[PDB]
């Protein structure tokens, strides 16, 4: 029914904001509720291994590939102008203030934005997440709080590693594959980036996603209906919403500081 079709559309629209409110309530209860008996730093270490260290190969190979792509592309574009000796400035500018954090968002929200959701989802749907409440250990401060704290402090480091490897792998193609002066590359690079305006800007732009990607990647896993299909649908809702959030919040955070 068309009127019931609009009813269902409005229902989904209100469900979205209801879920957003439930999600921020869940994040509040997770980050600063109380110190549960089972809580410890070993949790954070295990998750930092499950979220960051496992996501190192993907992000490093991505950095190398996207870096040599950025270089081999700009060198063509700069060849017509003649300032190819400034290619090093280009990759260190785009892959460090815009394409660095954005791609490492689209990618950290792909591996650890889906692995996290599927993991704690399969937790919820095998009662492993409920059986923690019977033992008394609040699941938030034990199952998700280390996920949140291992996403907050592992996506910025991933973005830094990604930008470093991308810059280096852009040099490795501009220099030893397309032949520009390596010294010129590095020199013209470190004269036009203005750390306090581009490097720290990219780091803040990456932190804001790190907060908004590991929050909608662990909520969407703590909220999926407990079945084998609700989980396979949540590990797609989280990738969609996290790529969308990376893009949108990067648009905001670059309009906030050009």
């Amino acid at each position: 029914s068309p009127l019931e079709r609009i009813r269902l559309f409005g229902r989904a629209g209100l469900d979205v904001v209801a879920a957003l409110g439930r999600s921020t309530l869940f994040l509040g209860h997770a980050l600063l509720g109380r110190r549960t008996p089972g809580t410890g730093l070993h949790l954070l270490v295990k998750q930092l291994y499950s979220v960051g260290v496992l996501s190192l190969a993907i992000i490093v190979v991505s950095g190398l590939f996207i870096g040599m792509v950025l270089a081999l592309q700009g060198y063509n574009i700069l060849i017509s102008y003649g300032s190819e000796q400034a290619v090093g400035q280009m990759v260190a500018l785009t892959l460090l203030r815009e394409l660095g954090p954005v791609v490492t968002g689209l990618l950290f929200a792909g591996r650890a934005g889906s692995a996290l959701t599927a993991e704690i989802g399969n937790m919820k749907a095998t009662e492993q997440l409920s059986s923690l409440e019977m033992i008394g250990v609040d699941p938030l401060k034990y199952i998700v709080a280390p996920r949140l704290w291992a996403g907050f402090i592992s996506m910025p480091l991933l973005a830094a590693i990604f930008s470093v490897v991308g810059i280096w792998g852009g040099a490795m193609v501009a220099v030893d594959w397309l032949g520009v002066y390596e010294g010129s590359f590095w020199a013209n690079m470190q004269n036009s980036v203005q750390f306090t305006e581009d490097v720290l800007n990219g780091v803040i732009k990456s932190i804001v996603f790190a907060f908004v990607v590991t929050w909608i990647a662990v909520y969407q896993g703590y909220d999926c209906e407990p079945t084998s299909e609700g989980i396979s649908r949540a590990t797609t809702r989280t990738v969609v919403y996290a790529s969308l959030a990376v893009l949108g919040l990067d648009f905001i955070l670059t309009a906030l500081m050009f």
């Binding site: 904001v17 209801a18 879920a19 957003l20 409110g21 439930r22 921020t24 309009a255």
Partner: protein
């Protein structure tokens, strides 16, 4: 009634998200601890070819403010530029002449204000009476450099 609280918090946070409009949201464009308010001023020119809004109005080179309006008067067909000047500088005499200079050789054309000399400073919300136009390439070339040869 948990949906009530969830929707309440969801709206209270979607507001804080749309509290990031970020489209001329901070009408002051420097920081949260700089000078702040600004004075208004107008000038009537014969040609304002390159005075695109949000440019720079300066004195002796140091930026003083930005152009806000580029209006045109219907009666005299002269462009009326409405700019603002930072609060720190408020001591420019009325006889000061505004002239449009070209930054470098091709850079954005800015409006400088060469100080004349008088005691009465300004109303800072009033207009300028004198000026010097913006030398456009075509009219200049055709008139003078063509006239020599």
């Amino acid at each position: 009634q948990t949906r009530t609280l969830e929707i309440g918090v969801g709206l209270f946070l979607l507001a804080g998200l749309l509290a990031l409009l970020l489209l001329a949201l901070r009408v002051s464009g420097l920081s949260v601890g700089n000078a702040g308010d600004t004075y208004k001023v107008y000038a009537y020119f014969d040609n304002i070819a390159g005075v695109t809004v949000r440019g720079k109005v300066t004195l002796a080179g140091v930026t003083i403010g930005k152009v806000t309006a580029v209006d045109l008067d219907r009666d005299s067909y002269t462009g009326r530029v409405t700019m603002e000047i930072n609060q720190n500088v408020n001591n420019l005499p009325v006889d000061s002449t505004a002239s449009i200079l070209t930054a470098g050789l091709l850079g954005e054309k800015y409006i400088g204000i060469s100080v004349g000399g008088d005691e009465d400073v300004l109303k800072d919300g009033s207009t300028i009476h004198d000026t010097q136009s913006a030398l456009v390439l075509e009219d200049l070339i055709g008139k003078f450099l063509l006239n020599s040869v």
